[PDB]
């Protein structure tokens, strides 16, 4: 399942072997024209042994890394380059990121061509994978994953009520239009637009309306994405319920505007990959609660 592609040159032997019994400390030493220099420490049930320097070390180009006993490297960044010669591309920058808080400086020239690998799903970092020798050509680690079936989309968890009938829509082919309606109290009227089939669906107030009117934004579905939400909740009197009058949505290249006024409590929805098609919550008259769905809409 996850297992991330050994992105760059092909000029050493170094990649994914079960010859290495351990490691301890990793350098990349970025020379003239690139990462030139590398060492590879191991630690044995006593003590450490060195003597794994390889390439060609200069005053101006070394790094240092000690790996802890304890510490998960649990993303990093890598870029590669290539110039007009370079028959076997390089590396350029690594920059390790650990699970303790631990976050080393570029190794190199940060540079547009590059990938990123993180784990989320609980995996932990193993060993690495990538030909090198003199020259750094490609770096990477693989992941621990599962192996489970093609599923359905996932459901997931809001916060808001525990009374009021439930409107979840589950999905819809997609958004292509948006308003909102506000109220004297918070969100109380929400509207959406999409197309079925070949249908053109217009209207969608399943909320109490108010004399505030609409608001309205047409989000290019083919050319931008919802990748999170945002809102914030304050807490209403009288009853244990909570209500909603400042709710966002994150938008990138755009700039969604700041509907309604933020106070209360805050609160976010957001996944890896999967992007958002559908709600799930409560109302009656005011929006209650409000959730959304993931779905991977990934190429």
Same mark, same amino acid.
């Given at each position: 399942?996850?297992k991330?592609?050994?992105?760059?040159?092909?000029?050493?032997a170094?990649w994914?072997?079960?010859?290495?019994?351990?490691? !301890?400390?990793?350098?990349?030493?970025?020379?003239?024209?690139?990462?030139?220099? &590398?060492?590879?420490?191991?630690?044995?049930?006593?003590?450490?042994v060195?003597?794994?320097?390889?390439?060609?070390?200069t005053?101006?180009?070394?790094?240092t890394?000690?790996?802890?006993? #304890?510490?998960?490297?649990?993303?990093?960044?890598?870029?590669?380059?290539?110039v007009?010669?370079?028959?076997?591309?390089? =590396?350029?920058? =690594?920059?390790?990121?650990?699970?303790?808080?631990?976050?080393?400086?570029?190794?190199?020239?940060?540079?547009?061509?590059?990938?990123?690998?993180?784990?989320?799903?609980?995996?932990?970092?193993v060993?690495?994978?990538? !030909?090198?020798?003199?020259?750094?050509?490609?770096?990477?680690?693989?992941?621990a994953?599962?192996?489970?079936?093609?599923?359905?989309?996932?459901?997931?968890?809001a916060i808001?009520?525990?009374?009021?009938?439930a409107? #979840?829509?589950?999905?819809?082919?997609?958004?292509?239009?948006?308003?909102?309606?506000?109220g004297?109290?918070? &969100?109380?009227?929400?509207?959406?637009?999409?197309?079925?089939?070949?249908?053109?669906?217009?209207?969608? $107030?399943?909320?109490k309306?108010?004399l505030?009117?609409?608001?309205?934004?047409?989000?290019?579905?083919?050319? $931008?994405?919802?990748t999170?939400?945002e809102?914030?909740?304050?807490? =209403?009197?009288?009853?244990?319920?909570?209500?909603?009058?400042?709710? !966002?949505?994150? /938008?990138?290249?755009?700039?969604?505007?700041?509907?309604?006024? $933020?106070?209360? /409590?805050?609160? $976010?929805?957001k996944?890896?990959?999967?992007? &958002?098609?559908?709600?799930?919550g409560?109302?009656?008259?005011?929006?209650?609660?409000?959730?959304?769905?993931v779905?991977?809409?990934?190429?």
């Amino acid at each position: 399942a996850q297992k991330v592609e050994a992105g760059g040159g092909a000029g050493g032997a170094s990649w994914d072997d079960g010859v290495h019994d351990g490691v !301890r400390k990793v350098h990349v030493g970025q020379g003239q024209d690139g990462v030139s220099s &590398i060492n590879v420490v191991y630690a044995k049930d006593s003590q450490d042994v060195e003597g794994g320097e390889h390439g060609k070390k200069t005053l101006l180009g070394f790094e240092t890394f000690e790996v802890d006993a #304890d510490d998960y490297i649990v993303a990093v960044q890598v870029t590669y380059d290539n110039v007009f010669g370079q028959d076997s591309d390089i =590396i350029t920058s =690594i920059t390790f990121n650990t699970f303790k808080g631990k976050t080393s400086p570029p190794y190199g020239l940060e540079t547009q061509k590059k990938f990123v690998l993180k784990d989320k799903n609980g995996g932990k970092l193993v060993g690495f994978h990538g !030909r090198a020798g003199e020259a750094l050509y490609a770096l990477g680690a693989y992941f621990a994953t599962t192996t489970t079936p093609v599923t359905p989309a996932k459901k997931l968890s809001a916060i808001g009520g525990d009374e009021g009938t439930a409107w #979840d829509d589950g999905a819809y082919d997609g958004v292509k239009k948006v308003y909102v309606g506000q109220g004297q109290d918070g &969100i109380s009227a929400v509207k959406f637009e999409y197309n079925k089939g070949a249908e053109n669906i217009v209207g969608g $107030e399943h909320g109490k309306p108010t004399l505030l009117g609409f608001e309205e934004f047409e989000i290019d579905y083919p050319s $931008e994405y919802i990748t999170a939400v945002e809102g914030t909740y304050d807490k =209403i009197f009288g009853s244990d319920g909570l209500i909603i009058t400042m709710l !966002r949505f994150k /938008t990138n290249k755009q700039t969604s505007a700041p509907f309604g006024l $933020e106070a209360g /409590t805050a609160f $976010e929805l957001k996944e890896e990959g999967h992007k &958002i098609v559908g709600f799930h919550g409560k109302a009656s008259e005011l929006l209650h609660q409000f959730g959304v769905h993931v779905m991977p809409l990934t190429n």
